[PDB]
């Protein structure tokens, strides 16, 4: 699922609650900076809740955290 | 209540080559 339409780029937008799809991984959260160190051989990570807690950009090499949006 | 996202970010890896 690496090629879909015009959406190949979609320049990143941080510090906002957004529904995101990274390399076929659906999800919605808040994008923030990440001080946690990951192995470059990996892809992403999850928490004990079986939900993705952080992501890695396929193009540029970076670590980003997924913060759950405010709910009630 | 739940906050609804107003924008969608979908980003895919770069294309080195394709499968014809």
């Amino acid at each position: 699922a690496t090629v879909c339409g015009p959406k190949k780029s979609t320049n990143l937008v941080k510090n906002k609650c957004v529904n995101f799809n990274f390399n076929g991984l659906t999800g919605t959260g808040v994008l923030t900076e990440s001080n946690k160190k990951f192995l470059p051989f990996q892809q992403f990570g999850r928490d004990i809740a079986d939900t993705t807690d952080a992501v890695r950009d396929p193009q540029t090499l970076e670590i980003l955290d997924i913060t759950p949006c405010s709910f009630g | 209540f739940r906050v609804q996202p107003t924008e969608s970010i979908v980003r895919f890896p770069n294309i080195t080559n394709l499968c014809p």
Partner: antibody, heavy 120, light 112 residues
Framework: QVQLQQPGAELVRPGASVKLSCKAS????????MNWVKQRPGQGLEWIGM????????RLNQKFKDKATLTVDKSSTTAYMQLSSPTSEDSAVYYC?????????????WGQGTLVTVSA | DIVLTQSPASLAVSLGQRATISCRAS??????????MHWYQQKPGQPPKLLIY???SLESGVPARFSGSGSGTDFTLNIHPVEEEDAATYYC?????????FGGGTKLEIKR
């Protein structure tokens, strides 16, 4: 080509209101953030706040909290900024800069600038 | 939040020498084996411009005589060779924590 435009200067009397226009061209206005920077000569740089044109949500400094006011017009793709009772201490040049995101965030583009002077 | 401190407030560098400007931060902005810093060049009557992003990469369109790097809270901006067109005020920035803050600024003087 991405280009930003602002008026040259604006005059205001103490106690009145101000309106600053920032015109966007060559890119989607609602997708990216819009930041305002306060340059007071001799005081260096100061950060005002950002606004997201989509939902009209604002992140404002506590120093400018309750004073500055942000709003956007999605029809003409023009961002506005308003100040409450500009005083002599509020006279300065204001820029509207695009914030581009590749990993870390930096300011790629800037506005022509608008000189604000409060006098009778 | 995070506050930036630059010293000296003004620097005078002649032609051919090397210019060193330090941007000190209150807390460490380094994350993911990267750090958040940006340098800006402003001239009188002109808006600031982008010089070097993430300290490790030179922006397209900027001459190669500008360089820099650093780790932790103390980063340096190196200039060599110095030219007559380099006179300006410089600024450092951090996007690490909201709200972002702006550097104090440093005025550059060219000796001759």
């Amino acid at each position: 080509q991405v280009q930003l435009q602002q008026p040259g200067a604006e005059l205001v009397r103490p106690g009145a209101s101000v309106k600053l226009s920032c015109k966007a061209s060559g890119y989607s206005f609602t997708r990216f953030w819009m930041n305002w920077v306060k340059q007071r000569p001799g005081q260096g740089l100061e950060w005002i706040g950002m606004i997201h044109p989509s939902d009209s949500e604002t992140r404002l400094n506590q120093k400018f909290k309750d004073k500055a006011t942000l709003t956007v017009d999605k029809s003409s793709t023009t961002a506005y900024m308003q100040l409450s009772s500009p005083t002599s201490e509020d006279s300065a040049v204001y820029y509207c800069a695009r914030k581009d995101y590749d990993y870390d965030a930096w300011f790629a583009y800037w506005g022509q600038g608008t000189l604000v002077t409060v006098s009778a | 939040d995070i506050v930036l401190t630059q010293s000296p407030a003004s620097l005078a560098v002649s032609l051919g020498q090397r210019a060193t400007i330090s941007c000190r931060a209150s807390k460490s902005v380094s994350a993911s084996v990267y750090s958040y810093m940006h340098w800006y060049q402003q001239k009188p009557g002109q808006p600031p411009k982008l010089l070097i992003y993430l300290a490790s990469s030179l922006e397209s369109g900027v001459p190669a005589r500008f360089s820099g790097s650093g780790s932790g809270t103390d980063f340096t901006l190196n200039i060599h060779p110095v030219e007559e067109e380099d006179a300006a005020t410089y600024y450092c920035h951090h996007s690490r924590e909201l709200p972002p803050a702006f550097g104090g600024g440093t005025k550059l003087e060219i000796k001759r």
